[PDB]
Every structure is written in C-alpha cells, then in structure tokens.
Coordinates of C-alpha atoms and ligand atoms in Angstrom, one line a residue:
Chain A
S14 CA 6.0 -11.2 -17.7
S15 CA 5.6 -8.0 -18.4
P16 CA 6.5 -5.5 -15.0
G17 CA 2.8 -3.6 -14.9
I18 CA 0.6 -6.9 -14.6
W19 CA -0.7 -7.5 -11.9
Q20 CA -3.1 -10.9 -10.0
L21 CA -6.3 -10.9 -8.6
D22 CA -7.7 -13.1 -6.8
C23 CA -9.0 -14.2 -2.8
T24 CA -8.7 -16.7 -0.2
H25 CA -10.3 -17.0 3.0
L26 CA -9.4 -18.1 6.6
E27 CA -11.5 -18.5 9.3
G28 CA -14.4 -17.2 7.6
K29 CA -12.6 -13.8 6.7
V30 CA -12.2 -12.6 3.0
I31 CA -8.2 -11.9 1.6
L32 CA -7.6 -9.3 -1.5
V33 CA -4.8 -11.0 -2.8
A34 CA -2.4 -9.3 -5.6
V35 CA 0.3 -10.6 -7.0
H36 CA 3.3 -9.3 -9.3
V37 CA 3.3 -11.6 -12.0
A38 CA 7.1 -10.6 -13.3
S39 CA 8.3 -10.4 -9.1
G40 CA 6.2 -12.8 -7.0
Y41 CA 5.6 -9.5 -4.6
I42 CA 3.0 -9.7 -3.2
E43 CA 0.7 -6.9 -1.8
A44 CA -3.1 -8.9 0.1
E45 CA -5.4 -7.3 2.9
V46 CA -8.5 -8.5 4.2
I47 CA -11.7 -7.1 3.8
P48 CA -15.4 -5.9 5.2
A49 CA -17.0 -9.3 2.5
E50 CA -15.8 -10.0 -1.0
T51 CA -17.5 -6.8 -2.3
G52 CA -16.9 -4.3 -5.6
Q53 CA -16.9 -1.5 -3.2
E54 CA -14.4 -2.8 -1.1
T55 CA -12.9 -5.1 -4.1
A56 CA -12.5 -0.8 -6.2
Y57 CA -10.9 0.6 -3.3
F58 CA -8.5 -2.4 -2.8
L59 CA -7.3 -1.2 -6.1
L60 CA -6.9 2.4 -6.1
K61 CA -5.0 1.9 -3.3
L62 CA -2.5 -0.5 -5.3
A63 CA -2.2 1.0 -8.6
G64 CA -1.7 4.9 -6.2
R65 CA 1.5 2.2 -4.8
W66 CA 3.1 0.8 -7.7
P67 CA 1.9 1.3 -11.4
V68 CA -0.9 -1.0 -12.2
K69 CA -1.1 -1.4 -16.0
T70 CA -2.8 -4.7 -16.7
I71 CA -4.9 -7.1 -13.6
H72 CA -5.8 -10.8 -14.2
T73 CA -8.6 -10.8 -12.2
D74 CA -10.6 -14.9 -11.0
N75 CA -14.2 -13.5 -12.8
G76 CA -15.4 -13.3 -9.0
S77 CA -18.7 -11.2 -8.8
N78 CA -16.8 -8.9 -7.2
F79 CA -14.0 -8.0 -10.2
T80 CA -17.2 -8.2 -12.5
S81 CA -18.8 -5.3 -10.4
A82 CA -18.9 -2.2 -12.6
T83 CA -17.8 -0.7 -9.4
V84 CA -13.8 -2.5 -10.1
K85 CA -14.5 -1.2 -13.8
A86 CA -14.9 2.7 -13.3
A87 CA -11.5 2.2 -10.8
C88 CA -9.8 1.0 -13.3
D89 CA -10.3 3.2 -16.3
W90 CA -10.0 6.1 -13.5
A91 CA -6.8 4.5 -12.6
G92 CA -5.4 3.7 -16.5
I93 CA -6.1 0.4 -15.4
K94 CA -6.4 -2.5 -18.3
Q95 CA -9.2 -6.1 -16.1
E96 CA -8.6 -8.9 -17.9
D97 CA -10.8 -11.4 -16.1
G98 CA -10.1 -15.0 -16.3
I99 CA -7.5 -15.4 -17.4
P100 CA -5.1 -18.6 -15.5
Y101 CA -2.3 -17.3 -12.8
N102 CA 0.8 -19.1 -15.2
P103 CA 4.0 -17.2 -14.2
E110 CA -3.6 -19.8 -6.0
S111 CA 0.3 -21.2 -5.3
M112 CA 0.6 -18.7 -3.6
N113 CA -2.8 -18.3 -1.5
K114 CA -1.1 -21.8 -0.4
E115 CA 2.1 -19.7 0.6
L116 CA 0.8 -16.7 1.9
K117 CA -1.5 -19.4 4.4
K118 CA 1.4 -21.1 5.2
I119 CA 3.2 -17.6 6.2
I120 CA -0.1 -16.7 8.0
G121 CA -0.3 -20.4 10.6
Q122 CA 3.4 -19.4 11.0
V123 CA 2.8 -15.8 12.5
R124 CA -0.8 -16.1 13.5
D125 CA -0.6 -17.2 17.2
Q126 CA 1.3 -13.0 17.5
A127 CA -1.3 -11.5 15.9
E128 CA -5.1 -11.1 18.6
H129 CA -6.2 -10.1 15.1
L130 CA -6.0 -12.4 11.6
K131 CA -5.4 -9.0 9.8
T132 CA -2.7 -7.8 11.2
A133 CA -1.5 -11.7 10.9
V134 CA -1.3 -11.2 7.4
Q135 CA 0.6 -8.1 7.1
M136 CA 3.0 -9.6 9.1
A137 CA 3.4 -12.5 6.2
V138 CA 2.7 -10.3 3.4
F139 CA 5.7 -9.2 5.1
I140 CA 8.2 -12.4 6.1
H141 CA 6.9 -12.9 1.9
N142 CA 7.9 -10.2 0.1
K143 CA 11.4 -10.2 2.1
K144 CA 12.4 -13.7 2.7
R145 CA 15.0 -14.3 0.1
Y152 CA 17.2 -12.1 -4.3
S153 CA 14.0 -11.1 -2.4
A154 CA 9.7 -10.4 -3.9
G155 CA 10.5 -6.8 -3.0
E156 CA 13.9 -6.4 -3.8
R157 CA 13.0 -7.9 -7.4
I158 CA 10.2 -5.8 -7.8
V159 CA 12.4 -3.2 -7.2
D160 CA 14.5 -3.9 -10.2
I161 CA 12.4 -4.8 -12.3
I162 CA 10.0 -1.5 -12.4
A163 CA 13.3 0.8 -11.2
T164 CA 13.5 3.4 -15.1
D165 CA 16.8 5.4 -14.2
Chain B
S14 CA 18.4 11.6 3.3
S15 CA 18.5 7.7 4.0
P16 CA 16.4 5.9 1.5
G17 CA 14.8 3.8 4.8
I18 CA 13.0 7.3 6.2
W19 CA 9.6 8.5 6.8
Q20 CA 7.4 10.9 8.4
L21 CA 4.3 10.4 10.1
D22 CA 1.2 12.5 11.2
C23 CA -2.6 13.1 10.9
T24 CA -4.1 15.5 9.6
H25 CA -8.0 15.9 9.9
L26 CA -11.2 16.9 7.0
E27 CA -14.8 16.1 7.3
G28 CA -14.1 15.4 11.1
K29 CA -12.8 12.4 9.2
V30 CA -9.0 11.0 10.4
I31 CA -6.7 10.5 7.3
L32 CA -2.7 8.6 8.5
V33 CA 0.5 10.5 6.2
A34 CA 3.4 8.9 5.8
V35 CA 6.5 10.6 3.3
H36 CA 9.7 9.0 2.9
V37 CA 11.4 12.1 3.0
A38 CA 13.8 11.1 0.3
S39 CA 11.5 10.8 -2.1
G40 CA 8.6 12.9 -1.8
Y41 CA 6.5 9.0 -2.1
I42 CA 3.6 9.0 -0.6
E43 CA 0.8 6.6 1.6
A44 CA -2.7 8.0 2.7
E45 CA -5.0 7.1 4.5
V46 CA -8.3 8.0 6.6
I47 CA -8.9 5.2 9.4
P48 CA -12.4 5.0 11.9
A49 CA -10.1 7.1 14.4
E50 CA -6.7 7.8 15.2
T51 CA -5.5 4.9 18.1
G52 CA -2.4 2.4 18.2
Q53 CA -4.0 0.0 16.5
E54 CA -5.3 1.4 13.3
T55 CA -1.3 3.0 13.1
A56 CA 0.3 -0.7 13.6
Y57 CA -2.2 -2.0 11.2
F58 CA -0.8 0.9 9.9
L59 CA 2.7 0.9 10.2
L60 CA 2.6 -3.5 9.1
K61 CA 1.3 -2.4 5.5
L62 CA 3.5 0.2 5.0
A63 CA 6.8 -2.2 6.2
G64 CA 6.2 -4.9 3.8
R65 CA 5.9 -2.6 1.4
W66 CA 8.8 -0.5 1.3
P67 CA 11.7 -0.7 3.6
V68 CA 10.6 1.1 6.9
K69 CA 14.0 1.8 8.9
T70 CA 12.8 4.9 11.7
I71 CA 9.8 7.1 10.9
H72 CA 9.5 10.4 12.7
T73 CA 6.4 11.1 13.8
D74 CA 4.3 14.0 16.1
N75 CA 4.4 12.6 19.9
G76 CA 0.8 12.1 19.8
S77 CA -0.5 8.7 22.0
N78 CA -1.2 6.4 18.9
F79 CA 2.2 6.8 18.2
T80 CA 3.7 5.0 21.5
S81 CA 1.1 3.3 22.3
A82 CA 2.0 -1.1 23.4
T83 CA 0.6 -2.3 19.8
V84 CA 2.4 0.5 18.2
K85 CA 6.1 -0.2 20.5
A86 CA 5.3 -4.0 19.7
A87 CA 4.6 -3.4 15.7
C88 CA 8.3 -1.3 15.1
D89 CA 9.9 -4.5 17.5
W90 CA 8.5 -7.2 15.3
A91 CA 9.2 -5.0 11.9
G92 CA 12.5 -3.5 13.1
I93 CA 11.6 0.1 12.7
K94 CA 13.4 3.1 15.5
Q95 CA 11.3 5.7 17.1
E96 CA 12.3 9.0 16.4
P103 CA 9.8 21.0 13.0
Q104 CA 12.8 19.5 11.4
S105 CA 11.1 15.6 11.6
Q106 CA 8.2 16.6 11.0
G107 CA 8.5 19.4 8.7
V108 CA 7.8 17.2 4.7
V109 CA 4.6 15.5 6.4
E110 CA 3.3 19.1 7.2
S111 CA 3.9 19.5 3.5
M112 CA 1.7 17.0 1.6
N113 CA -0.9 17.3 4.0
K114 CA -1.7 20.3 3.2
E115 CA -0.4 19.0 -0.2
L116 CA -2.2 15.9 0.0
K117 CA -5.8 18.6 0.9
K118 CA -4.5 20.4 -2.1
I119 CA -5.7 17.7 -4.2
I120 CA -8.1 15.6 -2.3
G121 CA -10.7 19.2 -3.1
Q122 CA -9.4 18.6 -7.1
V123 CA -11.0 15.1 -7.3
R124 CA -13.3 15.2 -4.5
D125 CA -16.3 16.0 -6.4
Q126 CA -15.0 12.7 -8.3
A127 CA -15.6 10.1 -5.1
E128 CA -19.4 10.0 -2.5
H129 CA -16.2 8.9 0.0
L130 CA -13.9 10.6 1.6
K131 CA -11.6 8.0 1.6
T132 CA -12.1 6.5 -2.0
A133 CA -10.6 10.7 -2.7
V134 CA -7.4 10.4 -0.7
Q135 CA -6.6 7.2 -2.4
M136 CA -6.5 8.9 -5.7
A137 CA -5.0 12.6 -4.4
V138 CA -2.3 9.7 -3.5
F139 CA -3.2 8.3 -6.9
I140 CA -1.8 11.4 -8.5
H141 CA 0.5 13.2 -6.6
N142 CA 2.7 9.5 -6.4
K143 CA 2.4 9.2 -10.2
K144 CA 2.8 13.2 -11.2
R145 CA 6.0 13.9 -13.8
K146 CA 8.5 16.4 -11.8
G147 CA 9.7 19.6 -13.4
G148 CA 9.5 19.6 -17.1
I149 CA 11.1 16.6 -20.0
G150 CA 13.6 14.4 -18.2
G151 CA 11.4 15.3 -14.7
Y152 CA 10.5 11.6 -12.5
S153 CA 7.5 11.5 -10.3
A154 CA 8.4 10.6 -6.2
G155 CA 6.8 6.9 -7.7
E156 CA 9.8 6.4 -9.3
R157 CA 11.4 8.3 -7.6
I158 CA 11.5 5.7 -4.9
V159 CA 11.5 2.7 -6.8
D160 CA 14.7 4.6 -8.5
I161 CA 16.2 5.2 -4.4
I162 CA 15.6 1.5 -3.2
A163 CA 16.9 -0.5 -6.2
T164 CA 20.6 1.9 -5.8
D165 CA 20.5 1.3 -2.5
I166 CA 20.0 -2.6 -3.3
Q167 CA 22.9 -2.7 -6.1
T168 CA 25.4 -1.1 -3.5
Ligands
4BI1 C1 -19.7 4.4 -3.2 C2 -19.4 4.0 -5.3 N1 -19.8 3.5 -5.7 C3 -19.4 3.2 -6.8 C4 -20.7 3.1 -7.6 C5 -20.5 2.8 -9.4 C6 -19.9 2.7 -9.5 C7 -18.2 3.8 -9.2 C8 -18.5 3.4 -7.8 C9 -17.5 4.1 -6.8 C10 -16.6 4.5 -7.1 C11 -15.6 6.2 -8.1 C12 -14.1 6.8 -7.9 C13 -13.1 5.3 -9.0 CL1 -12.5 5.7 -8.9 C14 -14.2 4.5 -8.4 C15 -15.3 4.2 -7.3 C16 -17.4 4.6 -5.6 C17 -16.9 4.7 -4.8 O1 -16.6 4.3 -3.5 C18 -15.7 3.8 -3.5 C19 -13.8 3.9 -3.8 C20 -15.5 2.6 -1.9 C21 -16.3 1.8 -4.0 C22 -16.3 6.1 -4.2 O2 -16.9 6.5 -3.1 O3 -17.5 7.6 -5.0

C-alpha cells in the first residue's frame, strides 16, 4: 500500500461524531470528536492531518461531508487526491477504536478526551502502528 | 537533543489564543487556535500530540494552564515529564508561524484555518538547496532512527 494513502471515515458514539483517518499501509490512526459531520469540520480535520503527515491520497466513504465543495477546496490547496467510494481493504478499525474507547471511558470526564486516549493506546500497541508509519514514511 | 523533547507555549493574534508545540531536534511544529488558554484545552492539545509522536518531556512557560490538575493527570497518563533556553526555540517559532500566517491570511476567512495552513507550509518547506530536508522529514527520520537503535 502506498505510504501516502489514508482511509477517511466516521463513527458515532454517545450521540457524537468522530472523524477517523487510517494510514492504510501501517494501520496508524488519527481520530477526533467533531462538533457536527459538516464539510467545514471535515476540511479543517484534513488540513491538520496534511500538515502533520504526508497525505497524498484519501479514500473516503463518500458521505456528504466529503462531497462538500469545502473539502474539495482543502484537498486542492493541500495537493490531496480525493477518491470517494473506495472501500477499506488493506470500518473494522472503527470497531477496534470503539473497543479501546470503552476500556478508558471511565477515566475521562468527556468523550473527546477518551477518544484521544484510545488513539494513543491503539497507535502504541505492539511493531506498533506508530513505529510502522514512521518506518514507512522515513525518507533518509 | 533527545527525540522526545518538545517546547510548548502560546502566542496571541487577532485577539485569539494559539497553542504552539515544537519538536526541538527537528523544528517540526504543531499548533492550533484554542477557545481560550485553559488547562482543559492544554491537556486536550497534549493528549492529541502524545498519541501521534513519542512525547517524553515538555518544556513550557509557567502559566497556570500548564500546571492544572487535568494537565498533570494527562501527562501522568501519557508518561510525559514536565519541566530562556527551554523556550527560545518555541518563541522563535511563534514569530515564524506569525510570519507565515500573515502571508496566507487572505486565503482563509478564519484564523484557525490560516494557522493550519501555516503549519503545513512550515513543516513541508525544504531547508537549504538540493540535498536539504523539511522539518516534517527530519522528525520522522530522527524517530525512525531511534526506534531502530
Ligand atoms: C469557511 C470556509 N468556507 C469555504 C467555502 C467554500 C470553499 C472553501 C471554504 C473554506 C476553505 C478555505 C481554504 C482551505 Cl485550504 C480550505 C477550506 C473555509 C475556511 O474554513 C474552514 C477550513 C474551517 C472550513 C476558511 O476559514 O476560509
């Protein structure tokens, strides 16, 4: 799997929306609770992702938040190729994420915090996805 | 010099608060406009950072937001040690970030957007000529080496 390809999807919990980004080649994940599943929030999420990791292509679930012209603008600016409707086949990752969230939920006063704790655990769990993504992306 | 050392601080622009984190060894930056400089926002910022990179130690100013019970709980949970030499780098980035923001501010309505655009531009920018690297390449390279050593 190309090192610049990310799978973009969503998942819901406690009446809240979580945007999920998975680095297909490593299984590394980035996720965050967002106010609403809108194009503006999705574009912002993508701009942050692209500025922290090499994002060359995103495969989305083709939800209306992704078909949004606002997201298209963000992708064009960041040089991201958007491919909608491409199923994840390296979400079952959403299940894993939800499972970990449950293991740390009572340690956080807010879901948003628990989600980040779950991402941390997932990425550092043993080679870990975190170690894998850096080894794959490293240029020198 | 260690790959797990980060310097954090804040900067103000347009009456808003920006939390900035710099990976000392690489110059790689993470920043974001936050509602207010509170302990809650700082802890959240830190947890997101720690889940992405191997944050071992953070050098911050002495503001109340960095020493709140929730920030300590977050650092405790993530295994992060809290500690002008330990702020000179991030302070330099505050200016560098502000400089880039001013160059693309017209390309976005909200400051929060321009901030992320600036972060992108800074981290992807190749330093030097042919043979040079970007800050984003440096942090990845540094960590990859540490993991395989
Ligand atoms: C409000 C907004 N509206 C838009 C409507 C149509 C197309 C693009 C945008 C962008 C836009 C502009 C530049 C890029 Cl690179 C990406 C999106 C923003 C953007 O806010 C976000 C980022 C919070 C949605 C901003 O602050 O300007």
